Every structure is written in structure tokens, then in C-alpha cells.
Amino acid sequence: IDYSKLSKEVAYALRHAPWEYGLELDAEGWVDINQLLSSLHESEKWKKVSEHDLHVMIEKSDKKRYEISNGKIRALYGHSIPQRIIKEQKCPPEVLYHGTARRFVKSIKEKGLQPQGRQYVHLSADVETALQVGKRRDIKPVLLIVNALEAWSEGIKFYLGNDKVWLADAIPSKYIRF
Ligand SMILES: Nc1ncnc2c1ncn2[C@@H]1O[C@H](COP(=O)(O)OP(=O)(O)OC[C@H]2O[C@H](OP(=O)(O)O)[C@H](O)[C@@H]2O)[C@@H](O)[C@H]1O
């Protein structure tokens, strides 16, 4: 089992297109794990995949993308579906980070950080994690430093993703150090 490719398939089902797998996510993103497995088994590549394989995929991952609880599974962040995933509001640390591509910096300066295709702006707890986010689009990514606690004190909402991935509503440029 190629766990990296399996994770990409699971991400598509749990973040982007659950309907394509015949799945319906609840308000917090959960779906029955046997329903996900049944849907994965529609694809020739994944007919061997067991629940055990999903736990191992999670255990071996660089990132805490998914969690399995009481026979249900969800993605913790990254969703793009029309129905807003309900996340817990959370006061952020003083500073969070956002790694991006050079070609987006002018637009972020003018408009702030926007959720774009996702439901939430995604932020990083540390510099190295943020640079890895930016490296997905740019070999020379730009580190943005977000005055997150200041933004929160002025009404910008932040939400729990995981220990390394923070979520937010749109963040005005005034809170972003370039
Ligand atoms: N006003 C504006 N004008 C122009 N561009 C703007 C803009 N505001 C923001 N942008 C940029 O628009 C891109 C959005 O791109 P994305 O939706 O992929 O967000 P992201 O890059 O944060 O990545 C999410 C997670 O996906 C991966 O997680 P996984 O590995 O899949 O688990 C990562 O690790 C993350 O945690 C980003 O470049 C923004 O900088």
C-alpha cells in the first residue's frame, strides 16, 4: 500500500468531494469509516485497503490530517465543500505564520489573506512548517508573519485545526508582516 497516494484519495473524499464517493459528512466533517472504506473499494487501486491501513496511514504521516474516533473518520482541515465545517473558536498565540508563493504577495498585501478555495485561511505554528506550505507552490517561498493575537483582539476569528495548523477567517493586511 502506497500510503501517500492513499492519503491523497482520502483527502479528496473528506475535504473536497464526498459526494463523488457517495458519502455525506456531518457538520464537523465526520463520516462512518466503513462507508469510506466501501467507497474506496470502488477503485481498483484500493480494494485491499482495511481500517487498519487507515490507522497506519495516519500514524506514519508527517501531518495530522485525519483522525479516527469511535468508528468515524474526518479531515481536520483543508475542506472546500459548500457546507461550512464547524470548528472550535480559539484564541491564537501572539504570532502565527503563513508560507506562500512570491507571485501571490502583491495580492495578499492589497487584500489580506483570503480563504480562496478553502473554507478557512490556514496558518502555521512555526516558521519551518510555514516554509513547507509555501514550497508546495514556490521553490523560494515567502514567509508571512501574522500578528494573530492582535487580529483576534480586533475581531478576527481563529479556529482549531491541529497543533501545527491554525484556521482563521480572512485576515486583513494590517496584521501581516511581509
Ligand atoms: N488575497 C490573496 N491573493 C492571492 N493569493 C492569496 C491571497 N490570500 C491567500 N492567498 C494564497 O492562496 C493560496 C491558497 O492555497 P491553499 O488553499 O492550498 O492554502 P495553503 O497554501 O495555506 O494550504 C492549506 C493547507 O494544505 C496543505 O495541507 P496538506 O498537505 O494538503 O495536508 C498545507 O500544508 C496547508 O496546511 C495560498 O498560497 C495563499 O497564500
> Which strands make up the sheet holding 66-69, listed edge to edge?
31-32, 72-75, 66-69
Cβ 46 under 6 angstroms from ligand 1: no
Show the 3-state SS of 135-174.
HCCCCCCEEEEECHHHHHHCCCCEEECCCCEEEECCECHH
78 lines ligand 1 (CB under 6 A): yes
Cα distances from 172 to residues 31, 35, 51, in angstroms, run 34, 40, 42
Q: Is 64 in the pocket of ligand 1 (CB under 6 A)?
A: no
Domains of the chain plus CATH, in order, are: 1-75 (1.10.10.970), 95-178 (no CATH)
Residue nearest to atom 31 of ligand 1 (CA): 78
Nearest CA to ligand 1 atom 26: 78
CA nearest to 1, candidates 69, 62, 55: 55
28 in Cβ contact with 67 (< 8 Å): no
Q: Long-range contacts made by residues 12-16, C-beta under 8 angstroms, separation at least 24? A: 13/39, 13/40, 14/66, 14/73, 14/74, 14/75, 14/79, 15/75, 15/78, 15/79, 15/80, 15/81, 16/79, 16/80, 16/81
Question: What's at 168, amino acid-wise?
Answer: A
Atom of ligand 1 nearest to the CA of 110: 1
Residue 57 three-state SS:
helix
Q: Whose CA is nearest to atom 34 of ligand 1?
A: 133
Q: Method used for this model? A: X-ray
CB of 113 closer than 8 Å to CB of 144: yes
Is the CB–ligand 1 distance for residue 57 below 6 Å? no
CA distances from 35 to 19, 40, 107, 118 (A): 12, 9, 41, 24
